Design an enzyme around this catalytic site. Structure first.
Site, PDB file in Angstrom:
ATOM      1  N   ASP A 179       0.680  -1.215   0.068  1.00  0.00           N
ATOM      2  CA  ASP A 179       0.169   0.021   0.050  1.00  0.00           C
ATOM      3  C   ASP A 179       0.869   1.064  -0.099  1.00  0.00           C
ATOM      4  OD1 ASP A 179      -2.497   1.347  -0.092  1.00  0.00           O
ATOM      5  OD2 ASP A 179      -2.684   1.089   2.173  1.00  0.00           O
TER       6      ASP A 179
ATOM      7  N   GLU B  74      -6.906   5.166  -8.470  1.00  0.00           N
ATOM      8  CA  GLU B  74      -8.144   5.517  -7.823  1.00  0.00           C
ATOM      9  C   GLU B  74      -8.930   6.414  -8.692  1.00  0.00           C
ATOM     10  OE1 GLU B  74      -8.790   5.662  -3.716  1.00  0.00           O
ATOM     11  OE2 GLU B  74     -10.833   6.582  -3.663  1.00  0.00           O
TER      12      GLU B  74
ATOM     13  N   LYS C 107     -10.035   1.955  -8.455  1.00  0.00           N
ATOM     14  CA  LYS C 107     -10.515   1.914  -7.532  1.00  0.00           C
ATOM     15  C   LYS C 107     -11.450   2.898  -7.261  1.00  0.00           C
ATOM     16  CE  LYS C 107      -7.099   1.420  -3.351  1.00  0.00           C
ATOM     17  NZ  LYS C 107      -6.304   2.119  -2.032  1.00  0.00           N
TER      18      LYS C 107
ATOM     19  N   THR D 259     -13.316   0.217  -2.534  1.00  0.00           N
ATOM     20  CA  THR D 259     -12.658   0.552  -1.344  1.00  0.00           C
ATOM     21  C   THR D 259     -13.653   1.293  -0.329  1.00  0.00           C
ATOM     22  OG1 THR D 259     -10.543   1.927  -0.766  1.00  0.00           O
ATOM     23  CG2 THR D 259     -11.756   3.018  -2.401  1.00  0.00           C
TER      24      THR D 259
ATOM     25  N   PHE E 287     -11.543  -1.584   5.510  1.00  0.00           N
ATOM     26  CA  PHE E 287     -10.412  -0.815   6.036  1.00  0.00           C
ATOM     27  C   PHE E 287     -10.433  -0.940   7.566  1.00  0.00           C
ATOM     28  CE2 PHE E 287      -9.961   0.990   2.236  1.00  0.00           C
ATOM     29  CZ  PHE E 287      -9.360   2.373   2.138  1.00  0.00           C
TER      30      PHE E 287
END
Ligand SMILES: [Mg+2]
Lengths: 310, 313
Positions: free
Chosen positions: B18, B99, B135, B159, B181
């Protein structure tokens, strides 16, 4: 020497926020508002247990085809209407009756519930002009209200926390919106662990109503701005001049007993735009959701009381 | 022979890095990598990239001399996001997640358009769409856009997953991968109960959320990859060994690389209408707050990058 209540009525439509209709005539408000929390309270406090028992009998009698859950839903509507009817006997204006908060994300079921409330008032001889249907101001609620207003049903868009949210209501031709002053200030206080209320000039809840009022008047929107859900009398006083303010019986009594001079202070969006603008407002995002959850808990508790009295 | 926790984890879970820092990626050898607007902004501000914006402006102006200022800035922003993705793809065997602009998160049609623009920019550089995950924030409109993108063979990474209902809706839409998350769910739990220390793993809401989604997916036969993301400490990562995938910051990868104990495998193998989804999300105060917050923070960083772009035009 005139009371603050008397002076406020000269510049603002005073509305009583209660289902305890016996309290209303003291204050001579123009309109009154109920919601699931206030209906529940009136039912739990028992002053009206005869009205409740009589409502359950009548609905059972007139609905032999309904199973238990459907019967209970129908009695819950009849209770909301029976309290409204008693309120209408002691005011000259309108009463707000709220749709079941559980349908807040479904426009079609909101439309159907709203029409059912109206039909029950009509069946009881009350014309729709005397009623506002309260609907939480999610996108779906606004879309339902848009259609209800086209059909001549006036709506009270409740749980208002953001200005864009109020602008979308006005754009939909809604009769009235209700910004929740005290809950906006609750967030502000909670954010910084504040133990004392902010100065009025810095009170987010008061400021929110001020901003919505200024937007409506400058743009010529005819939707009524009605501040609601106050924490103290100073928040109400701060909004003197607003189109309407809906006030608890405890604060109406404080305004009645206060004799000072009242200073008068107050004198298109697509779905994607609306959801974006709500998302930008952390307080509004949280408080709208929370409002629906709390009204849901109270509606479920009322259903349980109905179930216990079948 | 005996391996570090990181090398052991790779055997039971797809390890994903990440970060937007391709040099760091190189030394942990993850299979895939994920970027987001916050990580791209951090990279862009680092000394190595001090001329990156001016170069991208140059190149982008040249190739689109007729666009107005708004249109241009937009093209430069995609070019920057894709440039970091390409550098990452040069150093890994798998996929990179890039994203869409968080500002389109409530608009399915503009999400779809942005996603295709990203794919096109990679394709212009010789990178086929099978190396890229687009994303998208898992709002209802993000899930609708993903449902349509998957139909065209564009794989999406859904996400800001905070609730099992979002995850279920994502799976029902046939999305390639979801990213719960973990750390942020635990953050809410700690703030709700004035907790001074982290909850026991057994009681950690973030970890339990991924466990629940994994269980739900396997029991329902959903092929969507569950990828836990945004960890607070290495214990939360280790607690999910066996998960389909885990995307881990370089600081935590370094901690895993340096641990050598045995890694015990912890995870082993009605339809949601829009109104149902919105009701279930509404019942979840944490998810309601956290999804909205994630979009706001990604937006703040996207705007900050746009502003850096504008001051160089
Ligand atoms: Mg290859």
């Amino acid at each position: 020497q005139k009371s603050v209540l008397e002076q406020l009525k000269q510049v603002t439509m005073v509305v009583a926020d209660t289902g305890d209709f016996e309290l209303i005539k003291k204050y001579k408000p123009v309109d009154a508002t109920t919601n699931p929390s206030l209906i529940l309270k009136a039912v739990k406090e028992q002053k009206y247990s005869n009205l409740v028992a009589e409502t359950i009998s009548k609905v059972k009698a007139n609905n032999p085809d309904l199973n238990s859950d459907d019967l209970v839903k129908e009695i819950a509507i009849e209770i909301l209407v029976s309290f409204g009817i008693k309120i209408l006997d002691v005011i000259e204006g309108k009463v707000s009756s709220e749709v079941d908060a559980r349908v807040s994300f479904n426009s079609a079921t909101t439309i159907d519930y709203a029409k059912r409330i109206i039909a029950r008032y009509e069946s009881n001889g009350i014309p729709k002009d005397r009623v506002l249907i309260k609907i939480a101001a999610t996108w779906e609620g606004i879309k339902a209200a848009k259609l209800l207003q086209k059909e001549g049903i006036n709506c009270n868009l409740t749980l208002i926390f953001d200005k864009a949210q109020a602008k979308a209501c006005a754009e939909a031709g809604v009769y009235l919106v209700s910004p929740f002053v005290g809950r906006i200030t609750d967030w502000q206080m909670q954010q910084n662990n504040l133990k004392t209320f902010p100065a009025i000039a810095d009170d987010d809840g008061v400021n929110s109503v001020k901003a919505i009022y200024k937007l409506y008047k400058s743009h010529g929107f005819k939707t009524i701005v009605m501040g609601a859900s106050f924490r103290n009398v100073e928040q109400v006083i701060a909004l003197a001049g607003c189109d309407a303010l809906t006030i608890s019986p405890v604060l109406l009594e404080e305004l009645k007993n206060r004799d000072e001079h009242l200073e008068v202070k107050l004198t298109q969006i697509s779905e994607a735009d609306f959801r974006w603008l709500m998302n930008e407002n952390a307080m509004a995002t949280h408080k709208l959701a929370e409002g629906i959850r709390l009204f849901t808990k109270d509606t479920i508790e009322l259903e349980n009381i109905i179930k216990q009295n079948l």
